[model samples]
Target: AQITGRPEWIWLALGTALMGLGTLYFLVKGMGVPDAKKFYAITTLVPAIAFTMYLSMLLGYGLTMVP
Candidate 1:
């Protein structure tokens, strides 16, 4: 296995895992409750959280790499 040792990589992995959990929530747990709003909120939250983390990671990596 090759190791790049980038901090953003970890963040991406975490984001991916959380996104999977969010999907599971929407498909399984949230469905049992019959609350469409809760499901909708979680669906929106997953991408928003992942994107924000990615943006921050990109900025952090780019700035650190420049120097």
Candidate 2:
């Protein structure tokens, strides 16, 4: 039987939450730190990308099996 356990959902949720928060934090911080726009943009993009990946995984469309 395939069992749906709590840990699986918990980790996915946690990863998405943290990545999202990171993206938001950096985006907001970037607004006030115009001098570091380049650095902040890259930092913000990193977490934004990660958040998309996590979101895709949570939606059950980001997994694959490799041989």
Candidate 3:
């Protein structure tokens, strides 16, 4: 995260959220379940939740996660 400069860091963080969504797709379909609505719903929130946490980091909550 520290490697990149400003502006690009935000884009990279959003890209990571997209990657998480892709993973969620695999997890939902790969499990071979037909009516996994609740599971799918929960997994759907993963990206938004992670995005919120990422935003928190950008807003300085990241320091608490460090030493």
TM-score (C-alpha, index-matched) for candidate 3:
0.40
Best by lDDT: 2
Ten-residue region with minimum lDDT total, candidate 2: 58-67
Q: How would you encode candidate 3's per-residue C-alpha lDDT over 1-67 as one tens digit per residue?
A: 5764565555656665675676666567656673698876657666656656665665563432332
Q: For model 3, give the RMSD to the true fold.
A: 7.9
Q: Where is model 1 poorest over a 10-residue stretch in terms of lDDT?
A: 58-67
lDDT of 3 at 42: 59
Model 2 alpha-carbon miss at residue 63, Å: 13
Model 2 accuracy (lDDT, Cα) = 0.72
Q: Estimate candidate 3's alpha-carbon lDDT, on a 0 to 1 scale.
A: 0.60
lDDT of each: 0.60, 0.72, 0.60
Give candidate 2's error at residue 24 in angstroms: 0.2
Off by over 4 Å in 3: 1-6, 34-67
Tens digits of per-residue lDDT for model 1, 1-67: 2475676566665765676566566556445663698666666566556656665665576643253
**Candidate 1 lDDT (Cα, 0 to 1):** 0.60
Rank list by TM-score: 2, 3, 1
lDDT of 2 by residue, 1-67 (tens): 1475455656777888899998888788766764596766887778788888888787774332111
> What lDDT does candidate 1 reach at residue 42?
65
